[PDB]
Amino acid sequence: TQQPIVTGTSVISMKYDNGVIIAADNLGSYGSLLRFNGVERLIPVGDNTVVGISGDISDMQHIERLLKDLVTENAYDNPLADAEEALEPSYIFEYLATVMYQRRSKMNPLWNAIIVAGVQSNGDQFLRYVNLLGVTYSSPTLATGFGAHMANPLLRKVVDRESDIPKTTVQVAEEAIVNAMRVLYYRDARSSRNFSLAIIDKNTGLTFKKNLQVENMKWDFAKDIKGYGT
Amino acid sequence: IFSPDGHIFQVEYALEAVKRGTCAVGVKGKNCVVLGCERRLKLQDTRITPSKVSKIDSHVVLSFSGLNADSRILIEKARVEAQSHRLTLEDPVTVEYLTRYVAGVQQRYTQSVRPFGVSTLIAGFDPRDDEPKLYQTEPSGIYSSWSAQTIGRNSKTVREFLEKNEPPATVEECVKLTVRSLLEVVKNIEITVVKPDSDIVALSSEEINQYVTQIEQEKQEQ
Amino acid sequence: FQVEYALEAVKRGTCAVGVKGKNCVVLGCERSKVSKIDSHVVLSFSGLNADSRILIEKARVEAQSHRLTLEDPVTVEYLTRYVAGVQQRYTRPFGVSTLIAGFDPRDDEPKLYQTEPSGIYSSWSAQTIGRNSKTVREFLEKNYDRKEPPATVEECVKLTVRSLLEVVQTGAKNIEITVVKPDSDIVALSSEEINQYVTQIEQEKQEQ
Amino acid sequence: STFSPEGRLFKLGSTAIGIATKEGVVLGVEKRATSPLLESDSIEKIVEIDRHIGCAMSGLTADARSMIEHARTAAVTHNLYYDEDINVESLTQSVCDLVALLIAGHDADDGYQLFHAEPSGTFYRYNAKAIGSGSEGAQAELLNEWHSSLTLKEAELLVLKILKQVMEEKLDENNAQLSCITKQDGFKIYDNEKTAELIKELKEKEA
Amino acid sequence: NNYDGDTVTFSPTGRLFQVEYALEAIKQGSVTVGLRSNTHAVLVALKRNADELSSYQKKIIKCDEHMGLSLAGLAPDARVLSNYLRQQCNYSSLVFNRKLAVERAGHLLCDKAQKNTQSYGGRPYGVGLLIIGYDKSGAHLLEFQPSGNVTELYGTAIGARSQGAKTYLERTLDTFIKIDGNPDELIKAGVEAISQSLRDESLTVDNLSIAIVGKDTPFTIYDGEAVAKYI
Amino acid sequence: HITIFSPEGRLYQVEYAFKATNQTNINSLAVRGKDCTVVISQKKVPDKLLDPTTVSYIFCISRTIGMVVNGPIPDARNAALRAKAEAAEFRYKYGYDMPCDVLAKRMANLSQIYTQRAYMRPLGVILTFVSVDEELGPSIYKTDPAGYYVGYKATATGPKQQEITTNLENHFKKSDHINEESWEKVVEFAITHMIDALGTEFSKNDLEVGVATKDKFFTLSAENIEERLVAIAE
Amino acid sequence: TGYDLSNSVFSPDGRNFQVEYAVKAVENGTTSIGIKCNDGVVFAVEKLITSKLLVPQKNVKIQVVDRHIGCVYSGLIPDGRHLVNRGREEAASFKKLYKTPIPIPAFADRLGQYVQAHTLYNSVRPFGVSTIFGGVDKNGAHLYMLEPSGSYWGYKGAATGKGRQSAKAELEKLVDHHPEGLSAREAVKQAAKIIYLAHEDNKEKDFELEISWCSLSETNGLHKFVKGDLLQEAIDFAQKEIN
Amino acid sequence: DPSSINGGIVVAMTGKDCVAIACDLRLGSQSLGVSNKFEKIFHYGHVFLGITGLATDVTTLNEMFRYKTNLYKLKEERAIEPETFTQLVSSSLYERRFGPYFVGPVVAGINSKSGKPFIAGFDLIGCIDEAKDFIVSGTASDQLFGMCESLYEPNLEPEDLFETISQALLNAADRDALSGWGAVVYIIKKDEVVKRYLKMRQD
Amino acid sequence: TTFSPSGKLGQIDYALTAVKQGVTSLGIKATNGVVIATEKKSSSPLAMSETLSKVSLLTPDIGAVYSGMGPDYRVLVDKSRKVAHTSYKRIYGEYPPTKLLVSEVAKIMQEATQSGGVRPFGVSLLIAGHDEFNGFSLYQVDPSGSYFPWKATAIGKGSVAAKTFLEKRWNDELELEDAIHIALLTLKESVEGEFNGDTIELAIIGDENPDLLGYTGIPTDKGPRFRKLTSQEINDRLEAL
């Protein structure tokens, strides 16, 4: 692929005291045409992992097929595959990063930015970013596209450093994520009102809140604006 | 694979196949080279049956003995190489060069599949010289020059005749010696006269008859 | 036993003889097998001349390719090593043994080597290959001296012709001689030269 | 390419001997020139694989020479890629990864080593070893004479004594040849003069 | 018989003679013992010397800190199989950051070895391997044979006269699997087991080689002075 | 041991391949109607644990071409897969549905390839293609392991090939196609020839029937076979 | 005999002798069976305990392909592993081109082509395993048994190995006794009993019973292994029926 | 431009029973004239092939067609006819469709059996341009087309055919910068070929 | 396929034996045409013998008939057509002459005679054709790739008797219809079974057939010279016989 045609705009995620929260809107845009509104860009890969993908939607579906094949082939001749020697977030992310970098090297890149969020069996939160170039990094908060600029400051105001993670509860992180979705909806032209949110918790497992609405919009100040200048 | 004691089976058996094939005769003159073959059937088409003597280039011809099927492959290899040489260099191939190539192609099939069951006499003139040339080859892939030589099923007999029969002077003596070798060993004979300037001609049945009747009159005289 | 049968094939090739003097190396062959590989080096073989063609052509191509890859021409050691290497690689194999002789570039020491179907090669001061190699080698051992080597081209040619005439039927028509000299001054002895030396030795053989 | 029912897969050469010591490793080979015309100096039964590794062989047949070239390429490429001389055991493994052989050399990892390839290609490190038709007689003498405190000076005379005991002709500086590898000098071949004076030392010991 | 000489030919009774002779190849080799507890896995090997002047063959191959193996039979085939196992584990680490599970390694070696027993031109691997490792699922021990069969085991012995060692291991199975918190007694039981397979020879500081891996133990090979405390 | 000439000029390996076609011990029949072609073949289910629906030797090669195989079922299925691939390839490459006789010809050529190359053994199967051609109408084409093939007015194959062939010859000589007006009538006709020639009455489980019609080749189910059998009993 | 030192040969009788010698290898393998339910299929196999050193309940012999196909075999076990690997990559390829999991009949066709291919060329050995496989797809449950020759049929119940004859007799009696078909819960216990009866003529050595099954209802259409409570219920049922 | 770099002219005409093919002799590199002996007319038996365009391709095709026509002559035992030669040239030119020779050939000859005059032309990649009256190629294609159209008329006997073709070539070349330095005209008949060198402007 | 100690190629003689086991086929050259004839056997009375023609067109001027193994003839024929188009007509714009196509077919069969892993073809061909330069031609091509032109020849199980009959009947002044008469008589004398227009089949390399050209308006194109004689055409001659 040399150019993205149909794209999903942005994904954001942050880690809190007991796990990771990640969200993404359900809109795939054909240029400026908000063409497809039912796309799902959060890809669960287990009770401990969910993969958020941005960029070309066709490459996203290809990556989803790759993850399904990973899950399928892990269970071969693996009698313990359902409780230990199961696919950790680290293994998923490492495979995805290897594939992405190899595609980059062959000048046939997957035009996607991927956030793999989850919790390791030892309970440590996993949250890493990888893009088409193979560039990878970790942070208490991650975002893609306009999220890296609009949403990421809002999430960092909550957990600015690794020391703040244990201080952050489920409700605080979820409120931060929902506020980031509202802001991105306000200011990102490629964004949509509908978004999916997934919570991975070291205790309660994967919760996947689909088709949430952006709420508490503020528009009533628009009635006072009287055009440019006068 | 080598036989014990240093023989090579398939080359020996290809030599046997050559020995059981029809004959090919050659005589080189002072000013020309003459090749002769005995045609050795009443319904076979004489008008279009190919002569055993074949052109490899404008100035050089090839004659063969043994398996007829393999002769075509060998001849086309030689022709292709002769034209490729002119593709790479302006000058046409020398007779020595062509016999060397055919020896190589014969050899390569013995070490690489079966050897060609063919032996050949090669005659011609160098592209801008005038000396006569005559050369021989066999399945082993070896060649040598000659003054007059023969291959095929009558070789064990006609070879001593040719040894018995100072090269001949003029084309009449060359064709006479060839036809007398064919007749003395026992008129259905091909005769091809190779002359410089690429004049390659096969003598007609009536020309053959003239020479043959003259030689039979000489034989009657004793 | 494949290489053994190849050696048996070598045992039926025409004999070739080489002699190294102080300033000359001379090759002789029973009735040109001695063929020039590069301007300064030659190769002689005994056995299936059909199989010898591939070896000769590979050697020539390698010599020119070396002259093209390195500015310097091939040394006799290098060419002998290449001949051995190729002759191994086909182990049907080539039923041929060979001698390699000549001078190195801007050199003054004549070189002579022998190579075998086994791929074994070794330097020799004088060596024979072919059907009657044993008799000629025995003859050489009692006529060549490491501590009294030949001094001149005349001595080298005389010794080579005398060694070949041990078994050869009629020298003038049954032997050939080539003389290799420094700086690509290689020459082949003509009929009158070889006959001159042959008659010179004949005048003495009859006397004892 | 096929096992026998016993689980195995389906000696006449010239002798070579070698000794390993705390001070160095010494190698020796029977030359046995087949004619006085043959250039005795051209019989290279001992060759260098690397500046600290040499190989003594029963006979430099072309199959041996291809292996020599492969080993030399392995050593040179190891130096090129790692900027370090190849260790002896690593070189033997690389050659195995590719005739009776005495691979011997020196390195700072295991000091002085001598390796012999058993018929199945498995290299064994040896304190002293002999190959060729002379190995059958040599092995008992090697078992008798080697001691942990053996000096290189004594090892040279030991190998020369083995050659004298097994060879068909009286020892001289031409019909037999020695070589040794030392930490400071590297792999080197004893010239005819040094071989000669060692032969005279052997004679003086006999006297 | 006429069916012995090719790997792709069944006998009239359905046997693969060319693979059973590969098994005989292990029966030629010297004994190596392996055993495990819930936390540690141990290998014990009796090395061989070609001559009194010759050093012993290394019969333990370390893959990495969590896995290793020992040999019985043709050493070069062990080299090939071990480097393939190394390639697989290294590929797993690079592509997944994942420690190659010991059962996965065992079945990969099974799959590779099976190929030689079905296609013409290939020769069955004339070497059997004992593989030990420790991963997220605990200590493991595997037995590999030329036929491709791979078996997970509490303990075993392969090589000449290994039947006595296996008998001792079977007798003491209920004991050594209980060993907890310490590797010393497990190694002692291993050396006691291997001692059953000795005739006209005894365990010595030069014959014996010991290796171990476990929760607190990255794969280590004890030899020479280190093994003196166990002999 | 290989497909090479014996001194008699015979290919003993191909002759052995012919003999393998009778291993299954089942007979087949193909007949041409005015507008349809019919296949009758014995379904022998030796084991009661088998699923009878999956025991079949009639193959749907394309929309119009059906195939019938005698001989080992593994080779039959290999040939059927190859024929399906050839038919799809032809439809793709030349833009129209494959003729029945042209498929017979490529399958015969492919079988002949094994008869000459020693690398691979011939398939021990005899293939019978049936169709209502777009141009030539009803068609039957039997193929042999030797690479020999020919069209037929009617065909029988199996251990008792000769008896069915004799009955068909007698019927044709007493009457090139069957004068029936619908495909059911000709199916019943062929079933009656199976009943007479083999001297055996079939249950609805013992018969396979494939009927070739314009733009549809289909195989009759068990209850359709029962319908035809009761119509015969009528 | 002759004509049996090579694979790609017909004997004068038209018999591929090497394939039959491979079949005789299956006859020496441990018994494995499969049974179709009303809504699923069950697999079971004998695992002989050669010695007490074997780790119990870890040396598995039933294998899954993709997620809905279960495979079990007897004979040369590594040959069965090779066949299962090929089946796995075929299923992956099918799921790559298309998206529905490979139908059981399609997978059976793929495996039959692969196994039959090994009987075509002199250069490759026939498979020494007879494999019982099946699964659940859009058209319910299927059970297939595939022989070394590449032949395979759909089965109601199948058994292969040394004890195949008595297992087949008991499977016949099973399908006769249950004209309305078996449930998955019933069939697990029933297959345990069948395997236990099969061992009785092979009782020289101890064994471990491994069971697996796939069902629309009790696995939601995915292949799974019998474990824990249900496994032990089956074991007690089988032992009670043997006692 | 590879076709314009070396210049050169070729023109062919058909008489009542004879053909004429003529070319200029200049070879150069745009401005600079290099040689006055670069004859672009080649013959293979009784069929004549003129080639304009890049001179390296002219020589390469001369060698290629010499090789192919010699092999044809040997294995057919008969000379290649103008029609068969035209087909051979067309097939050989298209063989390099994507790497074509930058030449314009022109075939001229008399079919030995029928005895009918034959001429044909080509583009870079073998488009056969069989024509019954005359063929033109080279840098002066326009000049030659106009001149031949004005002068040519059917059934010219060999002398008038020579005069017409020579005048057409001369007057066309005198108006082309990259053509000239003399010309050679071949008059081809059923039993002889006459080669003539024309006097013309040397600038 | 290797030389035997006696110098003969071992397996070729077996191919010749297979040819001798084949049904009789004939070829006769008239001054103005060529006839090729052969009887076609049937596997059963039910088989549609009209489906298979032993005589086949190679080029509109060249036709072939065979004796021996039929499938080998079929594959050799479509190989021959492929080479005749790709190797000659694709280049020269014309169909290869009888000599050239015979040479290419002989090469095809000789490759099997000089290559491992493949047996020689078990068919001998009679390739009749016409040329503007060589004229009418008739060639017999053997399994070994050896081909020789014949005035008239016969192959198959009736080879010797048919040859001895043709030697009597053939003469330098036969017209095409006289050649057809002689071919009919010779093949009738060799057929042991029923002899009628459906068991025999004929083809002729004669004058141009614009009626078979399939299109009109091009004076230069001539139309096929090869044509098969229909069952009714042969029945007419056998009735007039």
Swiss-Prot record, chain A:
Q: Which keywords belong to this entry?
A: Cytoplasm, Nucleus, Proteasome
Stretches of the chain forming a coiled coil according to its record: none
Any remaining note in the record?
Present with 16900 molecules/cell in log phase SD medium.
Could you mention a single GO BP entry for this protein? proteasome-mediated ubiquitin-dependent protein catabolic process
Q: Which organism is it from?
A: Saccharomyces cerevisiae (strain ATCC 204508 / S288c)
Its biological function?
Answer: Non-catalytic component of the proteasome which degrades poly-ubiquitinated proteins in the cytoplasm and in the nucleus. It is essential for the regulated turnover of proteins and for the removal of misfolded proteins. The proteasome is a multicatalytic proteinase complex that is characterized by its ability to cleave peptides with Arg, Phe, Tyr, Leu, and Glu adjacent to the leaving group at neutral or slightly basic pH. It has an ATP-dependent proteolytic activity. PRE3 and PRE4 are necessary for the peptidyl-glutamyl-peptide-hydrolyzing activity.
Subunit architecture: The 26S proteasome consists of a 20S proteasome core and two 19S regulatory subunits. The 20S proteasome core is composed of 28 subunits that are arranged in four stacked rings, resulting in a barrel-shaped structure. The two end rings are each formed by seven alpha subunits, and the two central rings are each formed by seven beta subunits. The catalytic chamber with the active sites is on the inside of the barrel. Interacts with CIC1.
Q: Which coarse location class describes where this protein primarily resides?
A: cytoplasm
Which protein family is it in? Belongs to the peptidase T1B family.
Curated annotation (Swiss-Prot), chain C:
Gene Ontology CC: mitochondrion; nuclear outer membrane-endoplasmic reticulum membrane network; nucleus; proteasome complex; proteasome core complex, alpha-subunit complex; proteasome storage granule
Q: What does this protein do?
A: The proteasome degrades poly-ubiquitinated proteins in the cytoplasm and in the nucleus. It is essential for the regulated turnover of proteins and for the removal of misfolded proteins. The proteasome is a multicatalytic proteinase complex that is characterized by its ability to cleave peptides with Arg, Phe, Tyr, Leu, and Glu adjacent to the leaving group at neutral or slightly basic pH. It has an ATP-dependent proteolytic activity.
Q: Print the miscellaneous field.
A: Present with 16800 molecules/cell in log phase SD medium.
**A biological process from GO:** proteasome-mediated ubiquitin-dependent protein catabolic process
Q: Which NCBIfam families match?
A: PRK03996.1
Per UniProt, which keywords does this protein have?
Answer: Cytoplasm, Nucleus, Phosphoprotein, Proteasome
What is the protein's given name? Proteasome subunit alpha type-4
* Alphabetical list of CDD domains matching this protein: proteasome_alpha_type_7 (cd03755)
Protein's cellular compartments: Cytoplasm; Nucleus
What Pfam family is a match for this entry? Proteasome
> Which gene name belongs to this protein?
PRE6
Superkingdom per UniProt: Eukaryota
From which source organism is this entry?
Answer: Saccharomyces cerevisiae (strain ATCC 204508 / S288c) (Baker's yeast)
Which protein family is it in? Answer: Belongs to the peptidase T1A family.
From Swiss-Prot, chain G:
Q: Which GO molecular-function terms appear in the entry?
A: mRNA binding
Record keywords: Acetylation, Cytoplasm, Nucleus, Proteasome
Position of the signal peptide: none
Modifications made to the protein after synthesis? The alpha and beta forms are probably products of the same gene with different post-translational modifications.
Gene Ontology terms: biological process: proteasomal ubiquitin-independent protein catabolic process; proteasome-mediated ubiquitin-dependent protein catabolic process
Give the location in the cell: Cytoplasm; Nucleus
Cellular component (GO) terms are:
nucleus; proteasome complex; proteasome core complex, alpha-subunit complex; proteasome storage granule
Q: What does this protein do?
A: The proteasome degrades poly-ubiquitinated proteins in the cytoplasm and in the nucleus. It is essential for the regulated turnover of proteins and for the removal of misfolded proteins. The proteasome is a multicatalytic proteinase complex that is characterized by its ability to cleave peptides with Arg, Phe, Tyr, Leu, and Glu adjacent to the leaving group at neutral or slightly basic pH. It has an ATP-dependent proteolytic activity.
Q: Any extra detail in the entry?
A: Present with 12000 molecules/cell in log phase SD medium.
What family does the database annotate? Belongs to the peptidase T1A family.
The protein's name is Probable proteasome subunit alpha type-7
Swiss-Prot record, chain H:
| PANTHER family attached to this UniProt entry | METALLOPROTEASE TLDD, PROTEASOME SUBUNIT BETA TYPE-3
The listed locations are: Cytoplasm; Nucleus
User: This chain belongs to which protein, by name?
Assistant: Proteasome subunit beta type-3
PROSITE patterns named among the record's database cross-references = PROTEASOME_BETA_1, PROTEASOME_BETA_2
Phosphoserine: residues carrying this PTM? 29
Cross-link type Glycyl lysine isopeptide (Lys-Gly) (interchain with G-Cter in ubiquitin), placed at 68
Sorted UniProt keywords = Cytoplasm, Isopeptide bond, Nucleus, Phosphoprotein, Proteasome, Ubl conjugation
Q: Which GO terms describe its cellular component?
A: cytosol; nucleus; proteasome complex; proteasome core complex, beta-subunit complex
